[PDB]
Design an enzyme around this catalytic site. Structure first.
Site, PDB file in Angstrom:
ATOM      1  N   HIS A  61       0.708  -1.261   0.080  1.00  0.00           N
ATOM      2  CA  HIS A  61      -0.037  -0.048   0.117  1.00  0.00           C
ATOM      3  C   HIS A  61       0.915   1.205   0.135  1.00  0.00           C
ATOM      4  CE1 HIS A  61      -2.583  -2.932   2.138  1.00  0.00           C
ATOM      5  NE2 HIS A  61      -3.211  -2.803   1.291  1.00  0.00           N
ATOM      6  N   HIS A  91       6.086   6.991   5.989  1.00  0.00           N
ATOM      7  CA  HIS A  91       5.787   6.540   4.794  1.00  0.00           C
ATOM      8  C   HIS A  91       5.145   7.721   4.071  1.00  0.00           C
ATOM      9  CE1 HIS A  91       1.996   6.340   7.031  1.00  0.00           C
ATOM     10  NE2 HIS A  91       1.383   6.858   5.967  1.00  0.00           N
ATOM     11  N   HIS A  93       2.337   9.013   0.807  1.00  0.00           N
ATOM     12  CA  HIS A  93       1.309   8.785  -0.244  1.00  0.00           C
ATOM     13  C   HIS A  93       1.347   9.796  -1.572  1.00  0.00           C
ATOM     14  CE1 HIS A  93      -1.207   7.042   2.890  1.00  0.00           C
ATOM     15  NE2 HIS A  93      -0.448   7.811   3.707  1.00  0.00           N
ATOM     16  N   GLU A 103      -3.179  13.543   0.790  1.00  0.00           N
ATOM     17  CA  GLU A 103      -4.250  13.250   1.451  1.00  0.00           C
ATOM     18  C   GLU A 103      -5.092  14.364   1.961  1.00  0.00           C
ATOM     19  OE1 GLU A 103      -3.068   9.778   3.950  1.00  0.00           O
ATOM     20  OE2 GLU A 103      -4.091   8.818   2.133  1.00  0.00           O
ATOM     21  N   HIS A 116       3.882  11.037   6.225  1.00  0.00           N
ATOM     22  CA  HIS A 116       3.558  11.111   7.316  1.00  0.00           C
ATOM     23  C   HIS A 116       4.693  10.303   8.196  1.00  0.00           C
ATOM     24  CE1 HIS A 116      -0.803  10.667   5.688  1.00  0.00           C
ATOM     25  NE2 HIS A 116      -0.260  12.106   5.853  1.00  0.00           N
ATOM     26  N   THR A 195      -5.360   6.705   7.969  1.00  0.00           N
ATOM     27  CA  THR A 195      -5.829   7.299   6.765  1.00  0.00           C
ATOM     28  C   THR A 195      -5.935   5.770   5.954  1.00  0.00           C
ATOM     29  OG1 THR A 195      -4.001   7.886   5.539  1.00  0.00           O
ATOM     30  CG2 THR A 195      -5.137   9.472   6.566  1.00  0.00           C
TER      31      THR A 195
HETATM   32 ZN   LIG Z   1      -0.220   7.970   5.563  1.00  0.00          ZN
END
Ligand SMILES: [Zn+2]
Length: 257
Positions: A61, A91, A93, A103, A116, A195
């Site tokens: 992911h 990590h 996104h 996000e 994050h 999230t």
């Molecule tokens: Zn995250």
């Protein structure tokens, strides 16, 4: 079997994780015209001098850079927080295009990516206990825009080929997360959630106002990662972001005027 596809993306998550429609879900849009300065907030204290990164992992992911969280080596304090929060992993996104990927949004603006840095409250002893608590986690969120390279990201970029597919990990020692911070620690804060599933409502979000810049080559290497395992059909790890969720009965506070 949640993910970011057509048939298993964010709009589906509520079927297995009904808190997806809860009262304190993240991310949210940060309306800079309604967030209010809170003079009771303190400066953030980011103490990463003793941080011990261990490993990098493609979890299917995103990828996580993991730290030693068995002592107070890399901690976040201050700001809106009571007590001490230990860094466990960071990590990102990111998008398929530079016009999306974050996000959180700021006045509806999407950034190319979002970092994050995840921390857990030491009063709860372990991450797994912390996520069960409303004040269990503190996540420092940092926007990425495409422009100049970020030299302190390059070591991450260069290991990505070793962790292309789901389940791969690689040793990743001596990485300094201070190389991912912007100059300013001005922030917005609000109560929210993880999230990704399980979407637990355990997070004090601290979202920095100032983005970092990364190069177009750096983001391109993120987009070469795969959601799939080795020897499965290739699906590029892109657009691994959840869209903004309703603010509901929350207020976003600013640390700055
Ligand atoms: Zn995250």
């Amino acid at each position: 079997h949640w993910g970011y596809g057509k048939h298993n993306g964010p709009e589906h998550w509520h079927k297995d994780f009904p808190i997806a429609k809860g009262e304190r879900q993240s991310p949210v849009d940060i309306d800079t015209h309604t967030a209010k300065y809170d003079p009771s907030l303190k400066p953030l204290s980011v103490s990463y001098d003793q941080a011990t990164s261990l490993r990098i992992l493609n979890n299917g992911h995103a990828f996580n850079v993991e730290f030693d969280d068995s002592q107070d080596k890399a901690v976040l304090k201050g700001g809106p927080l009571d007590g001490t929060y230990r860094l466990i992993q960071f990590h990102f996104h990111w998008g398929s295009l530079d016009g999306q990927g974050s996000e959180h949004t700021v006045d509806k603006k999407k950034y190319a990516a979002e970092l994050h840095l995840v921390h857990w409250n030491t009063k709860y002893g372990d991450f797994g206990k912390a996520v069960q608590q409303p004040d269990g986690l503190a996540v420092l969120g940092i926007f990425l825009k495409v422009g100049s390279a970020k030299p302190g990201l390059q070591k991450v970029v260069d290991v990505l080929d070793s962790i292309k597919t789901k389940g791969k990990s690689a040793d990743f020692t001596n990485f300094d997360p201070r190389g991912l911070l912007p100059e300013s620690l001005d922030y917005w804060t609000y109560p929210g959630s993880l999230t990704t599933p399980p979407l637990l409502e355990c997070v004090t979000w601290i979202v920095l106002k100032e983005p970092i810049s990364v190069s177009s080559e750096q983001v391109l290497k993120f987009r070469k990662l795969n959601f799939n395992g080795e020897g499965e059909p290739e699906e590029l790890m892109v657009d691994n972001w959840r869209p903004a969720q309703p603010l509901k009965n929350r207020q976003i506070k600013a640390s700055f005027k």
